[PDB]
Each structure stands twice: as structure tokens, then as C-alpha cells.
Design a protein around this ligand. Structure first.
Ligand SMILES: [Cl-]
Length: 163
């Protein structure tokens, strides 16, 4: 219903926005109006470094060295098509969540209770293990603050919806 539609929209839109900013491209009107009220003045050079292995500063060094591959294997287990960008980049992690929520919509409409539960547990695992640590370590900026609040709310929602 409404919740899932909203979640799909936010993940897909935020992913698109970070892709555009990565490549120093203009944000299209459709995206802009969804997300305004603020800034879209994030430097492309900053955005290129919004990666888990870079932002999570206390990540054990040995883990930091294999982290992109850990991410890549997670994606492959859910048949997800990993971009041109590094696997631990925020744009890619958001795009992966977008794909999982899209699959959640299709499965809920098909009334597949078991698969639905599993896809929601995977969303929860991914957020707690990967996406949330990344977003909590973003520098301060209005777009970045928006993303962290959303992910924080999304983790709580997924937890309560699973128990
Ligand atoms: Cl720049």
C-alpha cells in the first residue's frame, strides 16, 4: 500500500540523484520536485567518495580491503546488476534497496507470504549491515541529513514489521 509505494519512490529517486551528482549531470525536473523541501549543490568530487569503505572510518583495515567484494557478493546473491560504480557507493546501495522494494511490491500483490517475508528480511539485513553504517557516517549537508533520517526510520519500520 502507501508505505511501500513511498519507500520505493524515495530509494529510486535518491539513487538517481546520487548518480547524477556523481557524474556532474543536471538533476531532471521529475527528480527535483519529488525531493525539494533542499540543496543540490553537492560537489561531484565529494559525492564520488561517498562509499562505505571510505566513510566508515573505524572499519577494520583488513575488512576495508575486501569490502567492495563483500558488497558485490551480497548483490549477486539477489541477482542484482552492479553498475559501473564501486559496490559500496551510496548510489549503488540505494539502487539495490530500490530493486528489493520493487520486488516487495510485486510479491505483495501476488500474495506470496513466504517470499515476501524473505525479501523484507534481506532489506533489513542489508540496511543494518551496510546501508545504515554508511549513512550514519555521511558529512553534514541537507541532502545527506535527509538520507540518514530516512534510512534510520526505514530500519525501525523493517524491524517492527518483521517481529
Ligand atoms: Cl567538484
Amino acid at each position: 500500500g502507501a508505505m511501500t509505494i513511498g519507500r520505493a519512490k524515495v530509494y529510486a529517486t535518491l539513487s538517481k540523484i546520487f548518480y547524477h551528482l556523481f557524474y556532474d549531470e543536471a538533476i531532471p525536473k521529475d527528480c527535483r520536485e519529488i525531493i525539494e523541501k533542499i540543496d543540490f549543490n553537492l560537489r561531484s568530487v565529494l559525492v564520488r567518495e561517498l562509499r562505505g569503505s571510505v566513510l566508515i572510518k573505524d572499519m577494520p583495515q583488513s575488512l576495508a580491503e575486501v569490502y567492495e567484494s563483500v558488497m558485490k557478493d551480497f548483490y549477486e546473491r539477489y541477482g542484482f546488476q552492479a553498475s559501473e560504480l564501486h559496490a559500496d557507493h551510496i548510489a549503488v546501495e540505494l539502487a539495490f534497496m530500490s530493486k528489493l522494494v520493487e520486488r516487495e511490491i510485486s510479491l505483495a500483490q501476488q500474495m506470496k507470504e513466504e517470499e515476501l517475508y524473505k525479501i523484507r528480511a534481506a532489506q533489513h539485513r542489508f540496511i543494518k549491515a551496510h546501508l545504515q553504517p554508511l549513512v550514519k557516517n555521511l558529512p553534514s549537508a541537507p541532502l545527506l541529513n535527509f538520507v540518514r533520517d530516512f534510512v534510520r526510520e526505514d530500519a525501525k519500520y523493517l524491524y517492527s514489521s518483521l517481529v
